[PDB]
Design a protein around this ligand. Structure first.
Ligand SMILES: Nc1ncnc2c1ncn2[C@@H]1O[C@H](COP(=O)(O)OP(=O)(O)NP(=O)(O)O)[C@@H](O)[C@H]1O
Ligand SMILES: [Cl-]
Ligand SMILES: [Mn+2]
Length: 451
RNA sequence: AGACUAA
C-alpha cells in the first residue's frame, strides 16, 4: 500500500512476466505517470530488467523526470538533462525516437520490460512502436505495460476525474475577437486553451495579451523555454497545441477546447495524394485527454471544461493508419519477423500485409527522407519506393501540370544549388509540405538541394 | 497540421 503521492512498496509480480502485456487504463490524474510508473521502475531495477520507458511528447517526458528523479535512468530526450554514466539499465525516450532507432543503423537494446505511457497516441510512429512491442511480448522476449486513460476503442469524452468538473458547451473563437466573448477574460483562474496550430495559437495569445492577461504559449517550438514557466511561476493562460494534450499537470482551473483539428488524408480518387482536411472534430480520446488536464485536484472543486461541438470517433481516413504500416513494414525483430500492429489497431486500413516493405537502399533512403529531409512518412515512402536516391531532387520538378505549387497565387520557382531556375512541381503531392508557409519554406530548401 | 530529434 501507499500514501502521499509516493509509489507503492508493493508491485504485482505478474506485470514482469514475459508474454504479459498489461493495460493500465486508469482515469486521468489517477497516478499512472507519477505514482505507478516509479513503483514499476524501482521494482524493474531490483529484478535487473533492461527497461525502456516511452513518453509521447517532451511534456510527458518532463512529468516522468519529476517522478523518477534520483533513479539511475538514461534520458534520451532533449527535454531532460543530465546524468550519465552509460551503465544505466533503464532508458527513457519519446515514442517517435524509439521508432526512429528501430528504423536506423543502430540496434536497440534487448529490453526485457517496455513501459509505454499514453499507449493510445495515434501518431504513426507511436502506432508502429506498439506493433513492435506487442510482437516482442507475443514472441516471449519481453513484458510490456501500456498506460492510458483512453485505450483504443475509447468512446467516452467525459471520464472520471479526481475532482468534479463542470462541463460547459459554448461557442469558442478560432481567431481574434473584438467583442462578445467576455466569459473568456472575466474568468478569475488559470486557463489551458488548446489550439489546432501554432499560428492559430499566436493570434489567440496576442488577443489575450491586449487585455493584460499573462499568456504562455506552448508547442514544439517553444517547449524548452516555456514549459518551466508553466511550473515556477504564475500565469493566466496557457495557449497550447496538442503537445500538452496528454499527461500535463498544469494546476489549472479551466480548459477551453474547441475540439477541432486538421487531419492529413490520403486521397485515392485519381493520382494518390495527401491533403489537409478540416478543421474536423477531434476524437473522443483527444476530447477526454484535453478535459483531463483539469479536475485533477480533489481540494479544488470548481474546475471547468468549456468545449464546442461533438467529437468524431471515425478517423479511418487519417493518413496515420497507413503511415504506421509504412514504418512497421520496415521494422524487424532480431529473429527475423516483421511486427504486426497491436491488436485493437488492426484493419483500420485495408492491409495488405507487407505491402510497404522496402529493399536495400530504398529503406535507407526512406529513413533519410524523414530524418534529414524532414518529409512526411507518406511522401518519403513514395520517393524511396520509386528507387530515387536521397540527394536526387529531380522528382520535385517532374510532376504533372496540376502539381505546380502556388504561393500568394504565383507559381513557386526554385533556384537550385547548381543555379537552375525551376518551377516547383513535385511528382507526389503532400499538402503537409506546402500548405503552411513555414513548411513550404522548408520544402523549397529541400527542392533547392540545401537540405 | 500536430508530434519526435536518438546511438
Ligand atoms: N507537481 C505536482 N504537485 C502537486 N500535485 C501533482 C504534481 N504532479 C502531479 N500531481 C497530481 O498527482 C495526481 C497524479 O498525477 P499523474 O501521475 O500525472 O496522473 P496520470 O494518471 O498519469 N494522469 P493522465 O496522464 O492525465 O492520464 C494528479 O492528481 C495530479 O494533479
Ligand atoms: Cl494538475
Ligand atoms: Mn500521465
Amino acid at each position: 500500500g501507499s500514501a502521499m503521492g509516493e509509489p507503492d512498496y508493493e508491485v504485482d509480480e505478474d506485470i514482469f512476466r514475459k508474454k504479459r502485456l498489461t493495460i493500465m487504463d486508469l482515469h486521468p490524474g489517477a497516478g499512472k505517470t507519477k505514482r505507478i510508473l516509479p513503483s514499476i521502475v524501482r521494482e524493474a531495477l531490483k529484478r535487473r530488467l533492461r527497461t525502456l520507458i516511452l513518453a509521447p511528447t517532451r511534456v510527458v517526458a518532463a512529468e516522468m523526470e519529476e517522478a523518477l528523479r534520483g533513479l539511475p535512468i538514461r534520458y534520451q530526450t532533449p527535454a531532460v538533462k543530465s546524468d550519465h554514466t552509460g551503465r544505466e539499465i533503464v532508458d527513457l525516450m519519446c515514442h517517435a525516437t524509439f521508432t526512429t532507432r528501430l528504423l536506423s543503423s543502430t540496434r536497440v537494446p534487448n529490453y526485457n520490460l517496455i513501459v509505454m505511457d499514453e499507449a493510445h497516441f495515434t501518431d504513426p510512429c507511436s502506432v508502429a512502436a506498439r506493433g513492435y512491442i506487442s510482437t516482442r511480448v507475443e514472441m516471449g522476449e519481453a513484458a510490456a505495460i501500456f498506460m492510458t486513460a483512453t485505450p483504443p476503442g475509447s468512446i467516452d469524452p467525459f471520464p472520471q476525474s479526481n475532482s468534479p468538473i463542470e462541463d460547459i458547451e459554448r461557442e469558442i473563437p478560432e481567431r481574434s475577437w473584438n467583442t462578445g466573448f467576455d466569459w473568456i477574460t472575466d474568468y478569475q483562474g488559470k486557463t489551458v486553451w488548446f489550439v489546432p496550430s501554432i499560428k492559430a495559437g499566436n493570434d489567440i495569445a496576442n488577443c489575450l495579451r491586449k487585455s493584460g492577461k499573462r499568456v504562455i504559449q506552448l508547442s514544439r517550438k517553444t517547449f524548452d523555454t516555456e514549459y518551466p514557466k508553466t511550473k515556477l511561476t504564475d500565469w493566466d493562460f496557457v495557449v497550447t497545441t496538442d503537445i500538452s494534450e496528454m499527461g500535463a499537470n498544469f494546476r489549472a482551473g479551466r480548459v477551453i477546447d474547441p475540439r477541432r483539428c486538421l487531419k492529413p488524408v490520403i486521397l485515392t480518387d485519381g493520382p494518390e495524394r495527401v491533403i489537409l482536411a478540416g478543421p474536423i472534430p477531434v476524437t473522443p480520446a483527444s476530447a477526454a485527454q484535453r478535459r483531463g488536464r483539469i479536475g485533477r485536484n480533489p481540494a479544488q472543486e470548481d474546475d471547468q471544461y468549456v468545449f464546442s461541438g461533438d467529437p468524431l470517433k471515425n478517423d479511418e481516413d487519417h493518413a496515420h493508419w497507413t503511415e504506421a504500416k509504412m514504418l512497421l513494414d520496415n521494422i524487424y525483430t532480431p529473429e527475423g519477423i516483421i511486427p504486426t500492429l497491436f491488436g485493437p489497431e488492426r484493419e483500420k486500413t485495408q492491409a495488405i500485409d507487407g505491402e510497404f516493405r522496402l529493399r536495400g537502399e530504398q529503406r535507407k533512403t526512406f529513413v533519410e527522407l524523414m530524418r534529414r529531409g524532414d518529409l512526411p512518412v507518406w511522401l518519403s515512402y513514395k520517393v524511396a519506393s520509386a528507387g530515387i536516391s536521397y540527394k536526387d531532387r529531380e522528382w520535385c520538378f517532374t510532376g504533372e501540370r496540376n502539381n505546380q505549387i502556388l504561393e500568394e497565387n504565383m507559381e513557386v520557382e526554385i533556384w537550385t544549388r547548381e543555379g537552375e531556375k525551376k518551377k516547383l512541381r513535385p511528382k507526389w503531392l503532400d499538402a503537409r509540405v506546402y500548405a503552411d508557409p513555414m513548411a513550404l519554406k522548408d520544402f523549397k530548401e529541400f527542392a533547392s538541394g540545401r537540405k
